[PDB]
A paper describes a structure:
Ras suppressor protein 1 (Rsu1), a leucine-rich repeat (LRR)-containing protein conserved from human to worms, was recognized as a major FA component and is important for FA formation and cell motility. Among the IAC components, tripartite integrin-linked kinase (ILK) associates with another two key players PINCH and Parvin to form the ILK/PINCH/Parvin (IPP) complex, which acts as an essential platform to recruit many proteins for the FA formation and signaling and provide a linkage between FA and actin cytoskeleton. Here, we solved the crystal structures of the Rsu1/PINCH1 complex and found that Rsu1 strongly binds to PINCH1 through a large concave surface on its LRR solenoid. The cellular data supported the inhibitory effect of Rsu1 on the IPP complex. These results indicated that Rsu1, by interacting with PINCH1 and preventing PINCH1 from binding to actin, modulates actin dynamics at the FA and thereby regulates the stress fiber formation and cell adhesion dynamics.
We prepared the Rsu1/PINCH1 complex by combinatorial usage of the purified fragments that contains the elements necessary and sufficient for the Rsu1/PINCH1 interaction and successfully obtained the crystals of the Rsu1ΔC/PINCH1_LIM5C and Rsu1/PINCH1_LIM45C complexes. The complex structures of Rsu1ΔC/PINCH1_LIM5C with one crystal form at 1.65 Å resolution and Rsu1/PINCH1_LIM45C with two different crystal forms at 2.2 Å and 3.15 Å resolution respectively were determined by the molecular replacement method. In the Rsu1/PINCH1_LIM45C complex, the nine LRRs of Rsu1 form a curved solenoid capped by the helical regions in the both N- and C-termini, named N-cap and C-cap, respectively. The N-cap consists of the α1-helix while the C-cap contains three α-helices (α2–4). Both the two helical regions cap the LRR-solenoid by forming extensive hydrophobic interactions with LRR1–2 and LRR8–9, respectively. Although lacking the C-terminal half of the LRR-motif, LRR9 remains folded presumably due to the presence of the C-cap. Consistent with our biochemical finding, the LRR-solenoid of Rsu1 interacts with both the LIM5 domain and the C-terminal tail (C-tail, folded as a α-helix) of PINCH1 through the concave surface of the solenoid, mainly formed by the parallel β-sheet and the flanking loop regions. In all three complex structures that we solved, the LIM5C fragment in PINCH1 and the LRRs in Rsu1 showed the essentially same conformation with the overall RMSD of ~0.3 Å. However, the LIM4 domain in PINCH1 adopts different orientations as observed in the two crystal forms of the Rsu1/PINCH1_LIM45C complex, indicating the intrinsic, structural flexibility between the LIM4 and LIM5 domains. The full-length structure of Rsu1 that we solved also provides a valuable information to uncover other binding partner(s) of Rsu1.
Author numbering:
A (entry chain B): 189 to 318
B (entry chain A): 5 to 251
The structure:
């Protein structure tokens, strides 16, 4: 019969909002951070939910350290920094990496195991003590 | 070496990896400087002692990595790479930088870690590199950091680990974008109060400063925490103390 809300799961009789494929009660279509409704203002979809203009800028504005652009895909968080999945690589040989790889921290930069093995002995000995 | 060059233009590989290939001269790399289409060139862990001016022919380079060679000097042509964003010169034998090196208009990340560099190594226009957001000067021989460091307003990361620094310029306080400051292993005794204008206490931020002959109260504040340090260097008593230490 009539469209049904996807937030409270109850039938609608009046104004039907349409977003992300699902129908929404106007007061039940809310941001996931602040419980404020949109009531007509533009929403921002992110992995299934929607946000207001500012919150989406606050919690999805991770910047890639390599290409210096806002990450749209999955974010790789390491050493107080963030990388795109396809941008994350060793800082010394540019070989692509994942968090499942064994890299070392060098001035908060990722260095692949082989490269660190190629490091000078005195440097590694000094880095042990740091 | 004659196989990674022929495959790169017909299949259009923008990224070239020739790391650890026993290369002592880029001119010996057959047809290397005809690959004007490449955007990334990795020549790390080789035996280069110099870089030819032919590097200018690779005008579309965005990532250039010379990590761990024996490079003693660079050509001025190195600053003609208009699309260059990342330049890794870490772990070499550089004690000088070529004339007009700071003419790089798009340089974002500069790594000069582990060389033989001091303040006199920097060209006059070095701090024209206002697009830099990360500068690593770790393991070098800097005694004095030039005030023009304040001109790098987009800098988020600055590493001066294991140098010969006796003092920090107050102009570091002008770096409003700084997230990381590495100043361990120097000969610093006091911090400029202007550093208090910055805030590096965040979980995403970094302030390492161990292995320095700090004055006792600063050391105590370090034993208390970074927040206590920044709070202390803003205080009036510490301003007076700083004024007394200078005089
Ligand atoms: Zn509803
Ligand atoms: Zn919100
Ligand atoms: Zn990226
Ligand atoms: Zn590596």
């Amino acid at each position: 019969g009539v469209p049904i809300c996807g937030a409270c799961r109850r039938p609608i009789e009046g104004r039907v909002v349409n977003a992300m494929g699902k129908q929404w009660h106007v007061e039940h279509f809310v941001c996931a951070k602040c419980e404020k409704p949109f009531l007509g203002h533009r929403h921002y979809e992110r992995k299934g939910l929607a946000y207001c203009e500012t919150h989406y800028n606050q919690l999805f504005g991770d910047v890639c350290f390599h290409c210096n652009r806002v990450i749209e895909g999955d974010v790789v968080s390491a050493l107080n920094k963030a990388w795109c999945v396809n941008c994350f690589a060793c800082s010394t040989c540019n070989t692509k990496l994942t968090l499942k790889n064994k890299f070392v921290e060098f001035d908060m930069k990722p260095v692949c195991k082989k490269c660190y093995e190629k490091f000078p002995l005195e440097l590694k000995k000094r880095l042990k003590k740091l | 070496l004659k196989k990674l060059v022929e495959e790169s233009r017909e299949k259009n590989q923008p990224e070239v990896d020739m790391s650890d290939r026993g290369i002592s001269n880029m001119l010996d790399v057959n047809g290397l400087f005809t690959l004007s289409h490449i955007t990334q060139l990795v020549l790390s862990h080789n035996k280069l002692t110099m870089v030819p001016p032919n590097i200018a022919e690779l005008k579309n380079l965005e990532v250039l990595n010379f990590f761990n060679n024996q490079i003693e000097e660079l050509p001025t042509q190195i600053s003609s790479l208009q699309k260059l964003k990342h330049l890794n010169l870490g772990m070499n034998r550089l004690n000088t930088l070529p004339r007009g090196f700071g003419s790089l208009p798009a340089l974002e990340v500069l790594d000069l870690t582990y060389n033989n560099l001091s303040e006199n190594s920097l060209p006059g226009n070095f701090f024209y590199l206002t697009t830099l957001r990360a500068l690593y000067l770790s393991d070098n021989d800097f005694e004095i950091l030039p005030p023009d460091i304040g001109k790098l307003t987009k800098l988020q990361i600055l590493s001066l680990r294991d140098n010969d620094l006796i003092s920090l310029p107050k102009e570091i306080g002008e770096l409003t974008q700084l997230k990381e400051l590495h100043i361990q292993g120097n000969r610093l005794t006091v911090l400029p109060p202007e550093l208090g204008n910055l805030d590096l206490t965040g979980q995403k931020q970094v302030f390492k400063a161990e292995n320095n002959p700090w004055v006792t109260p600063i050391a105590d504040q370090f034993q208390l925490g970074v927040s206590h340090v920044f709070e202390y260097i803003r205080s009036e008593t510490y301003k007076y103390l700083y004024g007394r230490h200078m005089q």
